[PDB]
Amino acid sequence: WVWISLYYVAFYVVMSGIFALCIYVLMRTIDPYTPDYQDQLKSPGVTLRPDVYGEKGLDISYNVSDSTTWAGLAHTLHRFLAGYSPAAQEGSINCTSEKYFFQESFLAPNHTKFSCKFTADMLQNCSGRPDPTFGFAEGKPCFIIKMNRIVKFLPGNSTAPRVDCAFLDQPRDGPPLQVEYFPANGTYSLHYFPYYGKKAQPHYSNPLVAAKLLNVPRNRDVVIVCKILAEHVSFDNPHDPYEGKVEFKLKIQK
Amino acid sequence: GMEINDHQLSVAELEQKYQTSATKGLSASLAAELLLRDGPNALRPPRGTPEYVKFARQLAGGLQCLMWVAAAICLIAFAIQASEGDLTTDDNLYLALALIAVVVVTGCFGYYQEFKSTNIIASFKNLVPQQATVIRDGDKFQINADQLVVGDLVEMKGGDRVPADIRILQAQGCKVDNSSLTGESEPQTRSPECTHESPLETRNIAFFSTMCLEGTAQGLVVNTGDRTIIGRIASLASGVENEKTPIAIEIEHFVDIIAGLAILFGATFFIVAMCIGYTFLRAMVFFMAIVVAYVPEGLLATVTVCLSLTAKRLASKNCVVKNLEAVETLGSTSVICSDKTGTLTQNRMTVSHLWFDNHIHSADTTEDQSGQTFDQSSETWRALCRVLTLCNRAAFKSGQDAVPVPKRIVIGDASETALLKFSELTLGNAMGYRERFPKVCEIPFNSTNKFQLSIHTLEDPRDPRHVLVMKGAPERVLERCSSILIKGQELPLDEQWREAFQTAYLSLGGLGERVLGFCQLYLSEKDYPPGYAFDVEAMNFPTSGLCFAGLVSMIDPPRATVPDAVLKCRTAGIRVIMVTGDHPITAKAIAASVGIISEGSETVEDIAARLRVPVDQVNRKDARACVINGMQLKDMDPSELVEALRTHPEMVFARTSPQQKLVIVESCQRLGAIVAVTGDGVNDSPALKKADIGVAMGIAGSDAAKNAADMILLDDNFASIVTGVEQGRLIFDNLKKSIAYTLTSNIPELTPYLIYITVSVPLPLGCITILFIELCTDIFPSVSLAYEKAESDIMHLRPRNPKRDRLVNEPLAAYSYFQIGAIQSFAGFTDYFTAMAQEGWFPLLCVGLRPQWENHHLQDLQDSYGQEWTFGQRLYQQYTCYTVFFISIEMCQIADVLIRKTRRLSAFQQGFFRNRILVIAIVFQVCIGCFLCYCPGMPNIFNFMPIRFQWWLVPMPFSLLIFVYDEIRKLGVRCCPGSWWDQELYY
Ligand SMILES: Cc1nc2c3c(ccn2c1C)[C@@H](O)[C@H](O)[C@H](c1ccccc1)N3
Ligand SMILES: *[C@@H]1O[C@H](CO)[C@@H](O)[C@H](O)[C@H]1NC(C)=O
Ligand SMILES: *[C@@H]1O[C@H](CO)[C@@H](O)[C@H](O)[C@H]1NC(C)=O
Ligand SMILES: [Mg+2]
Ligand SMILES: [Rb+]
Ligand SMILES: [Rb+]
Ligand SMILES: [Rb+]
Ligand SMILES: [Rb+]
C-alpha cells in the first residue's frame, strides 16, 4: 500500500520543479528599472495627509479648543515628514534645473542613479515650525498633497503641475475658499519627474505641496476636493475617486 | 369486496342478497340508488397529485440536497461576514443565488420532460366509454359500463368487453379472454357450474376487464369497480413502493465523496487557519468556503441534459420514458423478468401449422410477415384453402384496408378469425372471394352434429353442381370422411391414412394447439340440380362419406422481434427469466421458441423421462433449465428459492399470481440484481412497480401496467429493449467521461483560495469568475461527451457489477482532482505570478502582501518596482489576476475535454474530430472566452478585462503536458494492462 504514496510525491515534485523552473525563468525575464507593462498608470492618484478616514473616504473633524482632537493629526504629519528632513535625506542631490531631469546613466554606489531632494522647508508654515500643530490649533489646517510615483511618467514640459482645492457646491452659502499652498502657486517642480526605480533611485522622495485652509467656517461640515491641474492628469474618472483629485470632509469646531 | 362466496351461492340466495331478479333484472329505481351508494363502476385513479407538488419533487435528492446545503452555507457565511463587516460580499450572495438557480431550472427541465412524455402517452389512449347491455325491470338496453351497480343483470357476446365482475347465470358456448388477469393464452370456457372455490379459477365469473371471444352468457354483477379482481389487483400495485433508480443511487454515492472531501479539506484548512493566526470567526468562514468550493455548480444541469439527450434518442424509437433517470437503467440491468402473453407473444390466435398432402406445413406467424411461409403450389392446397375460406362465418370490420392484416378488428371469434386473417394473408380478399360462391344451407356449431357445415353453388355457370364444406373437431370430421385429397388425386380413406391422420392430430395437439379438421363433398347436379331445396331438420343432404381436406392448427404465436431480442440481451450477459400466469406446457413452448430456453437444455423432469428414472434421483445440478409452477412455488421458503434460482440458469415460472411475480422480483433484487420487468397485463402492475425499470407494451398494455411502468414501447416493438440497454450502457460510460471532466476544474478554483488563505497573496480568482467557468463556459463541452461512441463492444460486456463498477470510483476522482487539477493549478499559478510580476509586483513581494492589497485606505502602495498605485488601480490588477487565472483554466479545459473522449483508447486512433458535437462545443468555449475579455464594459459588470495576448500562451504548454501525460497513461494501461497501471490509474 506504500507504493502509491511515493507516486503522488514524484508527480508533485515534477510539477513543483516545473513550476520552480518558471519562477526562475520569470525573474530573469523582467527588467529591474522600467515597468514591464504598467497598464493602469494612464493617470496618477493623490494622497492626503493627515489621512484620517470615515465610513466612506476621508473625514477629518476636530475641536480647536481641545488639543486632543487635533494632536493626533499633527502627530501623523510630523511622523510622515521625518523622511522630509535633511538628516535622513542627505543621500541625494539638490536639483535647481527647474526643468525635466533625464538620467541616461547610473552614477552612485552599486550602479545607481542620482535622486532629487525635498525637505519640509518647501512647505513654509506647514513644516512644524514655527507651528508644530501645522495650522490645526489656529483653525487653519495644512494638508499635504502628494502624487504617486510612476516610472518614466511625465506630466508635461509645459509648466509645473499645481493643486487646486475648493468645495463641491455652496456658492451663495458663503465665500469661495482661499488656500495658500507652500510652495506658492502650489506647484511641484518639473525636475522631480520621472521616477526610475526603487533600485534605480533608492534615496528618493515624492515632491509635495501643502494646503493652508483659510476660509473654512467654524462648526460647519464642509467638503473639499484638492485636484491636480496638468495635461497628462485626468481627475474625472468615476471608478477611481482618488485619481488626480482627493476629496475630504472637514469640520472644525470651536 | 364480497367476492369470496359469490359464485358458491345459489341463485335463489343471490337475488335475496342483492335484492334483484335473475330473469327481470335490477329495478330501475334501486339500480339508481345503488350507484349513489357504491359510486361509479370504474376505478378511482391515484388522486392527490397537484401540479405544484410535481415540481417540489423535481428539486430533491442527491445534488439537490448538496447544492441546497452549499447554498445555505453561503448565506450563513454572509451573515457571519455581515456581522464582522465585509464589503462587496456580493460574492456570497451571487454564489448562493446561482446555486439555487441551477437547482430550480434543472427541476423545470425535468418537469416538462415528465409532463411532455405523459401527454405523448396520453394520446395513445382510447376515450370511448365502454358499454354494457343491461337488464332493468325486464328491459334490455345499452348503458355505459361505469353506470352498472352490484346486483345488475348483464349480457355479452363476441367482441363485448366484460362490463363488471359477473357471476355467470347461463352461458351458451361462451369463451372469454383472461389474458390480462391470469396469463391464460387459451380462451376460457364460461359456464354456471362452480369449477373451483377460488373466484380466480372458477368458470362462472366473467372478470371486470375481460373480453368475450365467442358465444353468449348472462349473469349477475357481483362486484363493481375497485372491488373487482381487476380492482383489488391495482390496489395491490399502489401498495407497492418502487425502489430508487440505479442512476440515482450512483449519484448519491458520488455525493458522499464530494461531501467526504469537502469536510476533510474544510477541517484541515480550518485547522491551518487557526494555527496560522486567524480568528475563529474567520477560520470558520474559510472552512465554509472550502466545503462550498467542492460543490460543482453546473454538474446537475450538465447531467440531466445528457439524460434528456438519450431519452430524446430513445423517444425517437417509440420508446417513451416517463422520468429521465430511467434512461440509464437498462444498461445497468442484469436480470429481466418477463411476462409471456401479450408481451412475448402476440396474444392473438394465428394459424401456425397445417396438415395436407401427408405433410405438416409451417405458416408465417410473424405479424409483419417476415417469417418463412409454406408450400402453396400444392393442388390440395388450393382445395383446403377453399374449404377454410367458405366455411367461415366471421368478417372484418369495415374500412380497415389501410391497417395491417393481423392488426385488423374482426367480428365473430378467434377460432374463426385466425382462419379469416390467415386467408386474407395467404389468399387475399377472402370475404369478397366467398361472395362468388352463394350459400344455400348451413349448420353452425351444433350439439348433436358437433360440426359446422354449409353448402354452396359454384362460381361459374358452366358448373351447376353444388359444394358442401365441413369443419370441426378433427376426429368428428374424419368419422364423416370416406375419401382424402392427397397429391393431385382423391384417395379412399383407408387404414394407412386413418393411422396417418391420428398421428398428425396428436402431433399438432402435443404443441397445445387448437386444431380443427376440414373436409368437402361435391354434390352432383344430377341428384342436386340448380335450386335444390336443402332441409336442415331432415337429412336430405349427406353428412357422411365426405372427402377429407386437411388439418389446420392455430396457436398464440410470439411477436416477431421477440426471439431475436431475447438472444441479443443474453449475449449482453442479462439473465432472462420468464414469469407468466399461463400453464407450464404453453410456458415452456414459448420459452423454447424465443430463447429463454436454448436448444439442448432439459429440466429435471426431462432427464427423468429420457432416462426413465423417478425425478427424485435426478441430480438437479444437471438441469440447465427448470420450470416452477406457482402452486408449488409457495411451498419452498426463500432459502429454497435461491438454491434453485442459482442452480438452474434458464429459469421459468409458470401459473404465477401478480403477488408471486412481485415476490420473484423482490427475491432477485434481494440478491443484488438490477431487475427489469416487461409487461402488458394488470397482473404485472405490481411486478412492474417494484422493478428497477418497469417496461410496458405501448398498445397491448393494460392501463395499470402502463401506469406502473417507467418506460413504454409505443409500438410494442420489443427490440426497443435491446437498444435501451445499449444507450443506457453508453451514457453510463459517457457520463463518467463527462463527469470526470467537469470536476477537474474544482481544484484550480480552490487552490487560489487556499493560497490566498495560507500564503496571503492578493486574491487570484473571484467567485464571479468561477461561476462563469462552471455555469457558462464548460457546460457545452461537458454535455458533448454524451456523444462519444462506445470504445469497446459494450453490448458484449456483462452488465456492470453494481458493487465494484461505479460511476465515480475512488480512482476516478483522485485522478481528476489531484493530478490534473494540480497541472491546472500550476498552470494558473504560473500565469498568476507572470501577470503581477510583469505588471510591477515581484512574487516574493506578493507573499504576505494581501492585507495591504485589499486595504481600502492605502492609496499609494509601492510594488517591487517602487511605484505607488491606488486601490481601484490595484483592484483592476486583481481582476486581471482573476481573468488570467480564468483563461489558464480554459486552455487546460480544451486539453481536458479531448482527454475524456476515451478512457482506454487514443485520439490518433479514434480521431480528434471524431464527433461533431464536442468540437462545435469547444469552439463555443473559446468564443465566450474571447467575448468576456475583449467586450467593452466587461470589467465593471464582471471581473473580466482585456488580457495581453501573451498571457493566453502561458498555459498552453501545460495543456500539452495534460495531453501527453494522459495519452501515455491511456497508452500504457491498454498496451500493458497487467495489474499496477489499471488499478491506481484507471477510471
Ligand atoms: C474557491 C473560492 N471561494 C471564494 C470565495 C470568495 C472569493 C473567492 N473565492 C474562491 C476563488 C469570497 O468572495 C466569498 O467569501 C466566498 C465564500 C463562500 C462560502 C462561504 C464563505 C465564503 N468564497
Ligand atoms: C470644543 O471643545 C471645548 C472644550 O473641549 C468645548 O467647551 C466646546 O463646546 C467644544 N465645541 C463643540 C462644538 O463641541
Ligand atoms: C507663513 O509664515 C510667514 C512668516 O513665517 C507669514 O508671513 C505668512 O503670512 C504665513 N502664511 C500664512 C498663510 O499665514
Ligand atoms: Mg399479460
Ligand atoms: Rb486635464
Ligand atoms: Rb465549486
Ligand atoms: Rb414454412
Ligand atoms: Rb418501477
Author numbering:
A (entry chain B): 37 to 290
B (entry chain A): 47 to 1033
From the article:
The gastric H+,K+-ATPase mediates electroneutral exchange of 1H+/1K+ per ATP hydrolysed across the membrane. Previous structural analysis of the K+-occluded E2-P transition state of H+,K+-ATPase showed a single bound K+ at cation-binding site II, in marked contrast to the two K+ ions occluded at sites I and II of the closely-related Na+,K+-ATPase which mediates electrogenic 3Na+/2K+ translocation across the membrane. One of the notable differences between HKA and NKA is the presence of Lys791 and its salt bridge partner Glu820 in HKA, which physically restrict K+-binding space at the site I position. In this work, to elucidate the molecular basis of the different K+ stoichiometry in these two pumps, we evaluated a series of NKA-mimetic mutants of HKA with increasing substitutions.
We generated the NKA-mimetic single mutant Lys791Ser (KS) and a double mutant Lys791Ser/Glu820Asp (KS/ED) of HKA and determined their crystal structures. The thermal stabilities and normalized specific ATPase activities of these two mutants are significantly reduced compared to those of wild type, suggesting the mutations destabilize the cation-binding site. Therefore, we attempted crystallization in the presence of phosphate analog beryllium fluoride (BeF) and K+-competitive acid blocker (P-CAB) BYK99, a high affinity analog of SCH28080 with a fixed ring structure, which stabilizes the molecular conformation in a luminal-open but K+-bound E2P state (BYK·K+·E2BeF). The Lys791Ser (KS) single mutant structure in the BYK·Rb+·E2BeF form was analyzed at 3.4 Å resolution. Anomalous difference Fourier maps from bound Rb+ in both mutants show unambiguously a single peak at site II, which indicates that the number of Rb+ bound to the cation-binding site in either mutant remains the same as that of wild type. Even though we achieved a 3.4 Å resolution for the KS single mutant, the electron density map cannot resolve some amino acid side chains in the cation-binding site. In particular, the electron densities corresponding to the side chains of Asn792 and Glu795 are barely discernible (red arrowhead), most likely because the mutations disturb the hydrogen-bond network in the cation binding site, destabilizing the structure. In the single KS and double KS/ED mutants, the Rb+ density at the cation-binding site is weaker than that in the P-domain at higher contour levels, reflecting an unstable cation-binding site.
